[PDB]
Design a protein around this ligand. Structure first.
Ligand SMILES: CCOc1cc(-c2c(C)noc2C)cc([C@@H](C)O)c1
Length: 127
């Protein structure tokens, strides 16, 4: 029933780089999803205490949210695009695992995921 510590967003010993794909993931992908009308539940870790979801973190062992993704991208946390893409997919999948078809949050995830897919479909070639 308690909240876990949030995922890490900084690790000074992780090697970093700034690729055109990672720049796209921030400037296009994250920006598009973050501004969406359905973004709000996903802009920070699930607060299982405030939401009274005492079994959330019993079921979800790899939490992810866009607040975390945003900080990771802004801190150059990633080495490659695939790591960031995996974070977004973890976020969606968590929502699908925990929730039920047709729940509001699932419809929201689905809308964001459709936009995600459209954007990732045009991920630029690494230069
Ligand atoms: C600030 C978080 O607000 C919400 C969080 C959820 C949520 C998430 C994210 N993952 O599982 C649940 C439940 C669902 C809803 C509303 C849309 O019902 C709102």
């Amino acid at each position: 029933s308690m909240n876990p510590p949030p995922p890490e967003t900084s690790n000074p010993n992780k090697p970093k780089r700034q690729t055109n794909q990672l720049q796209y993931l921030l400037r296009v992908v994250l920006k598009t999803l973050w501004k969406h009308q359905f973004a709000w539940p996903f802009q920070q870790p699930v607060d299982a205490v405030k939401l009274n979801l005492p079994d959330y973190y019993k079921i979800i062992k790899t939490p992810m949210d866009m607040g975390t993704i945003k900080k990771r991208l802004e801190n150059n946390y990633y080495w490659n695009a695939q790591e960031c893409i995996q974070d977004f997919n973890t976020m969606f999948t968590n929502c699908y695992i925990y929730n039920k078809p047709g729940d509001d949050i699932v419809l929201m995830a689905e809308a964001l995921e459709k936009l995600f897919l459209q954007k990732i479909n045009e991920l630029p070639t690494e230069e």
